[PDB]
Amino acid sequence: EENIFVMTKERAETQDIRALKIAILNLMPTKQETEAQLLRLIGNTPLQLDVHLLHMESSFYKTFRDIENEKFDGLIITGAPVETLSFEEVDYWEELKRIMEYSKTNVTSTLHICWGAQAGLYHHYGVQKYPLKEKMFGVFEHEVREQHVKLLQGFDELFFAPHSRHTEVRESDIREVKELTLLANSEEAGVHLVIGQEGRQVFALGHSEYSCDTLKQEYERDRDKGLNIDVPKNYFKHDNPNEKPLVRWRSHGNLLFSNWLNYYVYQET
Amino acid sequence: EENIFVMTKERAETQDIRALKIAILNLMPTKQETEAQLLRLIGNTPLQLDVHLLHMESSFYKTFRDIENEKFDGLIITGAPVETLSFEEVDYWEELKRIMEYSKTNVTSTLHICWGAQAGLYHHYGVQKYPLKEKMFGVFEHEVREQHVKLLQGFDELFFAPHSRHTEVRESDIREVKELTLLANSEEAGVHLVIGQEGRQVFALGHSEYSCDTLKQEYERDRDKGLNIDVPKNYFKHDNPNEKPLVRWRSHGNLLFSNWLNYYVYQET
Structure with missing residues (x-):
């Protein structure tokens, strides 16, 4: 045949897509590190992002007051060093409730991390947290629990993710909630990824x-405070803290944030 | 402060980038499956791709004759069912030599897969292949051997990849070649990723x-031919062939092809 056809994978025409409006609520005291990490991870998209930094009310930072009449495509609520307290004993609990209630109506998809996730689950769905006898601390094997969920697009069926916490939520408590879907758990570490209200x-x-080196730094920090803490699991070679950490979770950290931004924060029509 | 700044991750301005010209040389007899797999994997880029399909000389297909005066950004040379033969005994060896020589000068980066890789290593660098006493067959843990190599951008330090072959190349033989750099090996399966001449x-x-299901299909195909073949390793749960395969290699398959296309096939200036 004289005229041969070619296969063309069409370029992504994201040029004319409005920028995604994203807010990050940093509840951490070690503020800079968290911010930097999250900023690298949200680079995982060809789309343009306007990132608004927020913090509580006890110069790039704003407060809930400044944005309560605004709408966002996405919001990230980080963890915080308050996990052993009852949620209601946490100083800023009432302001956090206003933000989370606000997120239902004014944010397309809100990503909650660690304690922020427990706070979100507790407030939105009544899921309680519980103390652990020792710190869940290291990198753990997880398994995908749902097929054909956009958030898990490209995930290996088995993948690694870090945990660092002296508290937990229980799979059974999450199972009871119809509006929640368990996406990834670990035989050892339990619940990791959960989605509520279709990615809301x-x-x-x-x-x-x-x-x-985050787990490494935490280990040494706690060891120096004179805490009795074990080496993070599946992190140091031979459990030797002088060794370079083994990074097995990098790819699925990128996938998580990339899929969130691409399939949940960004919506068509 | 009255005027708060926002962090903006700028959108990828790939709109005005010329389409990447890519050729796929399918040496397989089970032609369609391979083509489909590779086509899905090269979807992993926001860039536009013109894919030209080629095959040997013993309607979307062309031959080397049609493109010998052309230049390509990228070329993929697949594996082939001829691994037990000496390279020179393979019917189309001489035409494959012309293509590989052509690739040095007329293709920015050529990706060789399985036997195609052995053929490329042998022809370009004199690396010989050797028979294995039993088939290297399953999904295997690999480790990254080089830091700050674009092709391994985003790779976990430990990652999984399938192997299926009754022959091998040896790390030591690859080590001897200055123009070769070993990127990923496996304690069990040996050499996987190697780069030559800076990604050329x-x-x-x-x-x-x-x-x-590729390994599954191969297992059953060989088992039915009456071959004595073991279950693929780390593939079926409990080594039970009636079980759904465990996919641990998906993410790094996407990363490999995405990084190849983005950092080696695409060049600036």
């Missing part, structure tokens, strides 16, 4: 956003 | 392009 909320209980 | 050639000895 995304909850990540582990710390997929962690960078290379 | 990329060699993948394993089969990261394999889809879910």
